[PDB]
Amino acid sequence: EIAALKXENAALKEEIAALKKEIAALXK
Amino acid sequence: EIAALKXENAALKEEIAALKKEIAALXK
Ligand SMILES: [Cu+2]
Ligand SMILES: [Cu+2]
């Protein structure tokens, strides 16, 4: 469960990184 | 560690929800 939770965390962090990149493209 | 990981998960999910709300406001 720790490993599975760690992986959900990495996936959410990557989605957060992509969403910020989408915001930057929208603002430019 | 499971509880702490669960909480990081809830915080990331709330940031994802806010970032999508920010994208919707930018697109409108
Ligand atoms: Cu990897
Ligand atoms: Cu709460």
Q: How many domains does chain A have?
A: 1
Rounded CA separation B1/A10 (Å): 16
When CB atoms are compared, the residue of B2, B9, B23 closest to A9 is: B9
Resolution to 1 decimal place, in Å: 2.2
Residue B16 C-alpha, separation from nearest chain A C-alpha, in angstroms: 6
Q: Can you tell me the distance from the alpha carbon of A6 to that of B2, in angstroms, rounded to the nearest whole number?
A: 9
Task: Give the pair of three-digit tokens for residue B5.
Answer: 């990981």
Extract the tokens encoding B14.
């709330």
Of A13, A17, A12, A9, which Cα lies nearest the Cα of B1? A9
**Euclidean distance between CA atoms A25 and B1, whole angstroms:** 36
Q: Which domain holds residue A7?
A: 1-28
Using only C-alpha atoms, chain A has a radius of gyration, in whole angstroms, of 12
Site of tokens 């720790």: A2
